[PDB]
């Protein structure tokens, strides 16, 4: 019925707009840059931790 149709509609729309937001964030996260503390021996461990 009429209300169920609209719930399907709205459900789809909310899921697709939401999807674009997380899609963007994921493309954005994949573009991030590692750290390089190679000039600081005391931070060698923090580097491999951060980059992992």
């Amino acid at each position: 019925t009429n209300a169920t149709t609209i719930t399907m509609d709205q459900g789809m729309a909310n899921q697709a707009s939401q999807a674009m937001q997380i899609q963007t964030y994921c493309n954005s996260v994949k573009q991030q840059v590692p750290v390089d503390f190679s000039q600081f021996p005391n931070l060698k461990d923090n580097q491999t931790q951060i980059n992992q």
Binding site: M8, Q18, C26
Partner: protein, 52 residues
């Protein structure tokens, strides 16, 4: 970045949950329609008009 991705994922859960519930309403509502037809509360003549 991680905190943000976490939020995007949480929002995605909500969205997916809403989608499941939307489908559940459709299934349940089709069930009601099957019952109503079987019991003789409605006929394919007036159900046809609903759908059209």
């Amino acid at each position: 970045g991680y905190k943000g991705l976490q939020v995007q994922a949480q929002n995605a859960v909500t969205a997916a949950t809403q989608m499941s519930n939307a489908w559940d309403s459709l299934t349940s509502d089709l069930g009601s329609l099957i019952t109503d037809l079987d019991k003789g509360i409605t006929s394919g003549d007036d159900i046809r008009q609903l759908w059209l």
